[PDB]
Design an enzyme around this catalytic site. Structure first.
Site, PDB file in Angstrom:
ATOM      1  N   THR A  74       9.211   1.875  -2.010  1.00 60.53           N
ATOM      2  CA  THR A  74       8.337   2.914  -2.310  1.00 60.53           C
ATOM      3  C   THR A  74       7.597   3.778  -1.178  1.00 60.53           C
ATOM      4  O   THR A  74       7.593   3.305  -0.240  1.00 60.53           O
ATOM      5  CB  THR A  74       7.456   2.754  -3.590  1.00 60.53           C
ATOM      6  OG1 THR A  74       6.595   3.972  -3.916  1.00 60.53           O
ATOM      7  CG2 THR A  74       6.805   1.744  -3.269  1.00 60.53           C
ATOM      8  N   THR A  75       7.026   4.763  -1.734  1.00 61.93           N
ATOM      9  CA  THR A  75       6.018   5.661  -0.700  1.00 61.93           C
ATOM     10  C   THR A  75       4.665   5.942  -1.346  1.00 61.93           C
ATOM     11  O   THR A  75       4.714   7.170  -2.109  1.00 61.93           O
ATOM     12  CB  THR A  75       6.797   6.696  -0.019  1.00 61.93           C
ATOM     13  OG1 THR A  75       8.154   6.583   0.130  1.00 61.93           O
ATOM     14  CG2 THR A  75       6.016   7.248   1.205  1.00 61.93           C
TER      15      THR A  75
END
EC number: 3.4.25.1
Lengths: 133, 242, 240, 232, 195, 240
Positions: E1-2
């Site tokens: 993810t970010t």
């Protein structure tokens, strides 16, 4: 408080000779309220005899009716104060010779006086006046 | 007198009171007197320590401990009880630091230690900690607080309180002192004279005064009064006690 | 006849648990009093404050606390038992929130903590925490609730309840007020509580001697009524 | 005899455990409760009267269901009744999980009797000061049981324990018949509550639950008021 | 993810993608990696989702306990410490990287990061997940000091947009939260709003 | 019996005392006397050995726990021995984990923590042994006396046991030399102390005395009849 009311007695009396019920009733209500909270001895008597005297001399019975039903409905009242009020109304109802006024006033003295007080002999005097009526 | 009810701490009274904690009250009032005062930027502590025998070294039975770096420990009652309570409080502070990663607030530490001392009040196989202790700290972002916790388990907040045979006496002469304004410099003097006047010389003589404080004057760190300030406080005492 | 009043786990003749009543009497031993009144959408808790000296910090001697962000609590008795019981109640509420994912209803919190106190009074390993509890809160589809718990583990909801030294007279006054069947608005509920305390104590107290907490539908957070608002409320009561 | 009325693990020289008898005496001092088994169902009721109408009657319920067809009422201590309800629910649901079939009420009574007599095994733990009335319907038959603080369990066509239980039992044995109907059973139960209710039952002053082929259900206040009016 | 969170004067802004997959198949495209842990303290979650949610509920319970006992909202330091100890005590079994962002009255807006293995650290930008290996140069080139709420919003939008278009483990929407003395503002970027 | 308050350590007197703890305190008054002195750089423990009969050896009263720390017991053999094994185990654990000797103050603090548990909790009898602790650490010699009330004191000297008040008042007469004395001087002072404890008909013979000395460079070494011979050769004669 007693100083306010005792320097007010000249001021409030010279104000009373104008009638002007609303504002004086409000200020006397405030001072009587604070003295009921503070449990003062002579200022309460002076202020309540003052208001009753002002209603009686100013010739309104609805206004003194309101005073009676407020400080009967209002709380923390000195019993001697209520006693002096009803006995003053007694000596302010037996000397008057106005039949409707007298009957209405004895009706008020009847419905205020739940919780009879040491002055109930003086109230017996007024109920014998009612006996005459 | 309650006989038949005060053999255990889990038995109430016909009047509804546990007599074990009341007997612990009695024991604390039969103990030494310790005063504490919280200054504007910290708290100070004072212990009246009786030298029962000159054979005892100075600093023996040190009574003003420090539970944490920013939290002191004044206590009156049983020295064994004092040390056990101090040890459990220190373990509690260390556990708080290990689990939560910052200094323990004085009110929270007082709550935890009061809960623990209560846990020894209401059981039958154990006995309530018959010692009353002080909690003091100074945090730059929280303030200064003081707490007295007696064996009854009640941790109430006192500006500056006393415990011992002169509880009421120290109350009378600490009430006359104005407190909330001056700092430790002008409070150590009052603490010294108060401790030196509450003590009785005709009976229970041979006492010494030890002091400790926490606050920004030592960077929010509890420590005993420095020897120079200590002798200065003693000098103000001997001048003021005349 | 007697002599069975020594152990919590011993049944006396006629099946009467003396020590539990001993704890109930110990509730009164705190010397204080507390009352709770509930309105259509409010629940007001007020308690008396006695200070032996100015030397104490009044900000930490509060007798009413907050279990969760919307559940408030008041209690009396032994203060150590009080704080232990509030700690246990907060623990139980947090455990409930963890396990079931939503806030504890007042009735279920009272039920669980009363079960805890029952287990305390059922086995002889525990002194049954001689402090009474009153819990308040708001619940959807049911509105405000006021519940009381006692060391025996007996819990019940109340339209109005009381505790302390003046329990019986406060309850009688509460009955006298509730038999009139009036809506009890929020200010009206608060004033009924203050009047009950003042009359059963006959003191007409200064506003600094009472702590008040209130929970409403528009303010589900348990708001501890601050000095400003309690002054407004009770001096208004004075003039009203 | 006094030295033996203090522990649950010592036999009196003549009889048996005296603490069990004292728990029973605690039971007999509780709120009166009457259960009646009709031909097609069972009914159990109790009085919820308490001073200080300030009390919220809906807050607590003396009649609770254990499963979809098992309900119970008590007489005696309150918190002990709640604890018994909790243990009974746990036991019944364990039986359900193990067998994936609604728990027969006989086994439920046996298991709850075992759990309450467990508290009577050793000292340091007092026996429950509560007696249970178990209502249930299964295999085309309405079952009514009584569970004891001693762990004893027995069946009952119609019984009543608590305060003034002897008079209620005499009333029931002078009223009950084997061919009783459910509605008439409720009428007899409310009359039994009445003859020693002492203070003019209202819709909420009493609490009555009913079980039948359609499971067990505690009667709502409206139906209670209707039945009270019908009896008058 | 970010999950990139960066603090500013007055608080912290935290953003994340909305992609959760079991293999090459996108299981859920509406994932929120910002779970409110308290009134004014949030978290950013990376790694195995179940572990992140479980530890989130655990620390929610713990700092709720602390906040209700002190009658005072928790500091960011205490919360970050709870995540640190939780991660370390299960580090042999925990595959989860957490960013502790939030604002407290004691100091202000704080960003605390506990990446894989449990470094309890604080920094300006806390980027996490499999998508945090791409915008690192992008943020280092676009790092400036003191982005206002609008400038912080644009930093988040552009950074997570590069992560979105460049990385296949970041998809769906972009969720933002702004924590300050006024309170917490939560906003969502979708459609033409994302650059 | 009004002394039903001394049957277990977990009950308080109505006057706020634990009479069981006081009886444990008085218990060590039964054992033989033992006095300790410490110099600028040397601490001595001298005890009066006692024998069940003259046909058997004298009961050892000086115990070695570690090279730098030594103890002397006065009271129950069982409790003192258990405390000694506990001391040895803790000193070894310190040497193993920290490679530094156990501090005297720290050792006595853990002693107090260990012995408080019997005083506080039902079960184990309170440790009714009076311990005299003499060791060396960074700030020099220490003498610690651990009273069986789970309390300890930092003392210049102490005599605990039977007729120990005579030695106490001897040391009270003779502070003024303890600090500046060397080995022989402090040893003779301690011997005069015991001789004050000992009545007229008896004297400090070789089999009667036990001497333990520790210092900065000299380990805690205990002397016996042949070893105490050089130290008693410098001893003077009893001022009778």
């Amino acid at each position: 408080y007693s100083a306010t009311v005792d320097q007010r007695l000249p001021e409030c009396a010279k104000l009373a000779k104008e009638g002007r019920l609303q504002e004086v009733i409000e200020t006397l209500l405030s001072l009587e309220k604070q003295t009921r909270t503070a449990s003062d001895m002579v200022s309460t008597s002076r202020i309540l005899v003052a208001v009753v005297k002002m209603c009686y001399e100013a010739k309104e019975w609805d206004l003194l009716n309101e005073n009676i039903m407020l400080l009967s409905k209002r709380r923390s009242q000195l019993k001697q104060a209520v006693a002096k009020m009803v006995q003053q109304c007694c000596t302010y109802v037996e000397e008057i010779t106005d039949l409707p006024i007298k009957l209405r006033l004895i009706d008020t003295l009847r419905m205020v006086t739940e919780g009879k007080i040491y002055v109930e002999i003086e109230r017996a005097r007024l109920t014998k006046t009612l006996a005459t009526i | 007198i309650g006989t038949g009810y005060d053999l255990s701490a889990s038995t109430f009274s016909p009047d509804g009171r546990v007599f074990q904690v009341e007997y612990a009250m009695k024991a604390v009032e039969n103990s030494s007197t310790a005063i504490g005062i919280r200054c504007k930027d910290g708290v100070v502590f004072g212990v009246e320590k009786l030298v029962l025998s000159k054979l005892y070294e100075e600093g023996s039975n040190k009574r003003l401990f420090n539970v944490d770096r920013h939290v002191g420990m004044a206590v009156a009652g049983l020295l064994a009880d004092a040390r056990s309570l101090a040890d459990i409080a220190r373990e509690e502070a260390s556990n708080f630091r290990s689990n939560f990663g910052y200094n323990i607030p004085l009110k929270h530490l007082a709550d935890r230690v009061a809960m623990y001392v209560h846990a020894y009040t209401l059981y039958s196989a154990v006995r309530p900690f018959g010692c009353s202790f002080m909690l003091g700290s100074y945090s730059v972002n929280d303030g200064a607080q003081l707490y007295m916790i007696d064996p009854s388990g009640v941790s109430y907040g006192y500006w500056g309180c006393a415990i011992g045979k002169a509880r009421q006496a120290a109350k009378t002469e600490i009430e006359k002192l104005q407190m909330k304004e001056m700092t430790c410099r002008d409070i150590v003097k009052e603490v010294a004279k108060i401790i030196y006047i509450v003590h009785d010389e005709v009976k229970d003589k041979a006492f010494e005064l030890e002091l400790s404080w926490v606050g920004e004057l030592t960077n929010g760190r509890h420590e005993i009064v420095p020897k120079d300030i200590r002798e200065e406080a003693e000098k103000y005492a001997k001048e003021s006690l005349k | 006849s007697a002599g069975f009043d020594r152990h919590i786990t011993i049944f006396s003749p006629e099946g009467r648990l003396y020590q539990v009543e001993y704890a109930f009497k110990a509730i009164n031993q705190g010397g204080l009093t507390s009352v709770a009144v509930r309105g259509k959408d409010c629940a007001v808790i007020v308690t008396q404050k006695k200070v032996p000296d100015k030397l104490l910090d009044s900000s930490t001697v509060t007798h009413l606390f907050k279990i969760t962000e919307n559940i408030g609590c008041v209690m009396t008795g032994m203060t150590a038992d009080s704080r232990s019981q509030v700690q246990r109640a907060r623990y139980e509420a947090a455990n409930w929130k963890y396990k079931y994912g939503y806030e504890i209803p007042v009735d279920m919190l009272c039920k669980r903590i009363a079960d805890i106190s029952q287990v305390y009074t059922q086995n002889a390993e525990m002194r049954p925490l001689g402090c009474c509890m009153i819990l308040i809160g708001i619940d959807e589809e049911q509105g405000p609730q006021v519940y009381k718990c006692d060391p025996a583990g007996y819990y019940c909801g109340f339209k109005a309840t009381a505790a302390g030294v003046k329990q019986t007279e406060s309850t009688s006054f509460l009955e006298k007020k509730v038999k009139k069947k009036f809506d009890w608005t929020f200010e009206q509920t608060v004033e009924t509580a203050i009047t009950c305390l003042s009359t059963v104590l006959s003191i007409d107290f200064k506003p600094s001697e009472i702590e008040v907490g209130v929970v409403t539908v528009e303010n589900p957070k348990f708001r501890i009524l601050t000095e400003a608002e309690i002054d407004a409320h009770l001096v208004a009561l004075a003039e009203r | 005899e006094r030295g033996y009325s203090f522990s649950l693990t010592t036999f009196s020289p003549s009889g048996k455990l005296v603490q069990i008898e004292y728990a029973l005496a605690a039971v007999a001092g509780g709120a009166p409760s009457v259960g009646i088994k009709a031909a097609n169902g069972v009914v159990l009721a109790t009085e919820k009267k308490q001073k200080s109408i300030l009390y919220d009657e809906r807050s607590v319920h003396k009649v609770e269901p254990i499963t979809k067809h098992i309900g119970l009422v008590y007489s005696g201590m309150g918190p002990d009744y709640r604890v018994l309800v909790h243990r009974a629910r746990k036991l019944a649901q364990q039986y359900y999980l193990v067998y994936q079939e609604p728990i027969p009420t006989a086994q439920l009574v046996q298991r709850v009797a075992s759990v309450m007599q467990e508290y009577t095994q050793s000292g340091g733990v007092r026996p429950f000061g509560v007696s249970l009335l178990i209502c249930g319907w299964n295999e085309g038959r309405p079952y009514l049981f009584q569970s004891d603080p001693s762990g004893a369990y027995f069946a009952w066509k119609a019984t009543a324990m608590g305060k003034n239980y002897v008079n209620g039992k005499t009333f029931l044995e002078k009223r009950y018949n084997e061919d009783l109907e459910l509605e008439d059973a409720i009428h007899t139960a409310i009359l039994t509550l009445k003859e020693s209710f002492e203070g003019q039952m209202t819709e909420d002053n009493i609490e009555v639950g009913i079980c039948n082929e359609a499971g067990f259900r505690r009667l709502t206040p409206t139906e209670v008021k209707d039945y009270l009016a019908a009896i008058a | 993810t970010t999950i990139m969170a960066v603090q500013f004067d007055g608080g912290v802004v935290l953003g994340a993608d909305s992609r959760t997959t079991t293999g090459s198949y996108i299981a859920n495209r509406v994932t929120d990696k910002l779970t409110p842990i308290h009134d004014r303290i949030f978290c950013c979650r990376s790694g195995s989702a179940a572990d992140t949610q479980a530890v989130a509920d655990a620390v929610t319970y713990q700092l709720g306990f602390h906040s209700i006992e002190l009658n005072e909202p928790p500091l960011v330091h205490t919360a970050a410490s709870l995540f640190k100890e939780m991660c370390y005590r299960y580090r042999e079994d925990l595959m989860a990287g957490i960013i502790i962002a939030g604002w407290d009255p004691q100091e202000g807006g704080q960003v605390y990061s506990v990446p894989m293995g449990g470094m309890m650290v604080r920094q300006s930008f806390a980027i996490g997940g499999s998508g945090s290996s791409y915008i690192y140069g992008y943020v280092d080139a676009t790092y400036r000091e003191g982005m206002t709420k609008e400038e912080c919003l644009q930093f988040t939008a552009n950074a997570l947009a590069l992560a979105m278009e460049r990385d296949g483990s970041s998809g769906g929407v972009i969720r933002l939260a702004a924590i300050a003395e006024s309170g917490v503002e939560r906003q969502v970027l979708l459609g033409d709003q994302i650059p | 019996f009004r002394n039903q308050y001394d049957n277990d350590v977990t009950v308080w007197s109505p006057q706020g005392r634990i009479h069981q703890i006081e009886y444990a305190m008085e218990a060590v008054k039964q054992g033989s006397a033992t006095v300790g002195l410490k110099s600028k750089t040397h601490a001595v423990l001298v005890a009066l050995k006692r024998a069940q009969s003259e046909l058997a050896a004298h009961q050892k009263k000086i115990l070695h726990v570690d090279n730098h720390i030594g103890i002397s017991i006065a009271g129950l053999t069982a409790d003192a021995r258990l405390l000694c094994n506990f001391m040895r185990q803790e000193c070894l654990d310190s040497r193993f984990v920290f490679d530094r000797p156990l501090p005297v103050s720290r050792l006595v603090s853990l002693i107090g923590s260990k012995t408080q548990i019997p005083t506080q909790r039902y079960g184990r009898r309170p440790y009714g042994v009076g311990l005299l602790i003499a060791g060396y650490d960074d700030m020099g010699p220490h003498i610690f006396q651990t009273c069986p009330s789970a309390n300890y004191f930092d003392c210049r000297a102490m005599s605990i046991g039977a007729r120990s008040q005579s030695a106490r008042t001897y040391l009270e007469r003779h502070m003024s030399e303890f600090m500046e004395c060397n080995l022989n001087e402090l040893v003779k002072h301690g011997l005069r102390a015991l001789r004050e404890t000992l009545p007229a008909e008896q004297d400090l013979t070789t089999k009667n005395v036990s001497i333990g000395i520790v210092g900065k460079d000299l380990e805690f070494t205990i002397y016996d009849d042949d070893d105490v011979s050089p130290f008693l050769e410098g001893l003077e004669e009893r001022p009778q």
